[PDB]
Amino acid sequence: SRKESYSVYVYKVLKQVHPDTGISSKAMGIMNSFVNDIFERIAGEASRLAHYNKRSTITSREIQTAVRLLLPGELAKHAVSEGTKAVTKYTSS
C-alpha cells in the first residue's frame, strides 16, 4: 500500500532555504515525525478550543489561537504572521 510522507514538501522547503544542502533518509524521517507531531498537537488544541466554546467547526481563528497557545514567544509571533499572510493570499483567489 502507499504510505504518505511529507518528504517532497520538506525537500522543497530545504531547497528554497538552503539551495545546495542535502538531507539523509533518517533526518527526513525525523522531519516527517516532527511535522506529524506538530500537526496533531495544533489540531488537538484547536479541537479542544472549538469544543470549549460550543462551536461545531474549526476555522482559521481556532488555528490561530492554538498556534498562540502552543508556540513559545517569538516563534508564535512569526507563525501567526505567516498563517495570516497565507490566508490573505488564499482569499484573493
Binding site: N53, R61, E62, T65, R68
Partner: peptide, 10 residues
C-alpha cells in the same frame, strides 16, 4: 497568558 488567550478567543 493562556487564560487571557482563552478569554480573547472566546
Amino acid at each position: 497568558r493562556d487564560a487571557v488567550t482563552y478569554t480573547e478567543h472566546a
